[PDB]
Structures are given as C-alpha cells and as structure tokens.
C-alpha cells in the first residue's frame, strides 16, 4: 500500500500479517527443541507469544506498527528472521550449559 519503506535495500511487503505469523510460528517451533529449563527459551518464547498475539488482534498495519514499537512492519519482519536464525544457531551452540571455565585468579582486576 505504501510506496517505500524509506530504507535502501528494504522492500515493502505486500502481506505483512501472514509473513509475521509464519515467522513467529517457525520461531516457536524451533524453540521447542531447546531444553525447557533454558533461560533463552522462556524469554524469547514469552516475547514471541507477546508479538504473535498482537499480529492476530490488530488488522490495521499502522496500528500494528504502533503496538509492536519495532519501527516499520518490514523492520519487524527482518528482526523476526534474525531471531529465527539466532534460535537455530543457539540450538547448535547450546549456551544453557554451565560455565566453560573460570578466568585466572586476577584476570579482571583493575587497576593493576
């Protein structure tokens, strides 16, 4: 409906609601493979359900951009894609495990 997003290389999406629903559902599906006790899973599941509920309750694009506070709907879609990629990588990295190793005795002491 709008001619430009104002950002070079960011194209206008004709179907923002469908794309956002697809992306948020895919994100939630990827999060199901993460351990339940992982702090990453709970937080991003919480914010994804929060954002997914808004996209299913507001059919107006401007009002949806206002409610999400993510800039523009194309920026929101791009951020959802980035979050999905991060979720896959985190599933690969598994950062919920305990600390790899402690630093040496005085590694952050300052001044020294």
From the list 12-20, 28-36, 54-62, 104-112, the region that binds other proteins by CB under 8 A is: 104-112
Number of C-beta neighbours around residue 106 at 10 A? 8
Taking the CA of residue 93 as centre, how many other CA atoms within 13 Å lie in the half-sphere pointing to its CB? Answer: 12
From the list 12-20, 28-36, 55-63, 83-91, the region that binds other proteins by CB under 8 A is: 83-91
Structure tokens at 17: 């609601």
The Cα 85–Cα 23 span in angstroms is 11
Query: Binding of other proteins at residue 91 (CB under 8 A)?
Result: no
The Cα 73–Cα 62 span in angstroms is 8
Query: Binding of other proteins at residue 25 (CB under 8 A)?
Result: no
Binder among 15, 36, 60, 104 for other proteins (CB under 8 A)? 104
* SS3 category, 45: helix
Instruction: Rank residues 7 and 57 by Cβ distance to other proteins and give the closer one.
Output: 7
Contact set with other proteins (CB under 8 A): 4, 6-10, 39-40, 42-44, 46-47, 51, 69-71, 78-80, 82-83, 85-86, 89-90, 93-104, 106-108, 110-112
């Amino acid at each position: 409906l709008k001619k430009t997003t104002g950002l070079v290389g960011l194209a206008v999406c004709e179907t923002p609601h469908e794309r956002l629903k697809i992306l948020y559902t895919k994100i939630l599906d990827v999060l199901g493979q993460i351990p339940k006790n992982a702090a990453y899973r709970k937080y991003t599941e919480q914010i994804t359900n929060e954002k997914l509920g808004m996209v299913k309750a507001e059919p107006d694009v401007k009002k949806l951009e206002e409610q999400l506070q993510g800039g523009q709907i194309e920026e929101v879609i791009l951020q959802a894609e980035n979050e999905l990629s991060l979720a896959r990588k985190m599933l690969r990295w598994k950062p919920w495990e305990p600390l790899v190793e402690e630093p040496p005795a005085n590694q952050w002491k300052w001044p020294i």
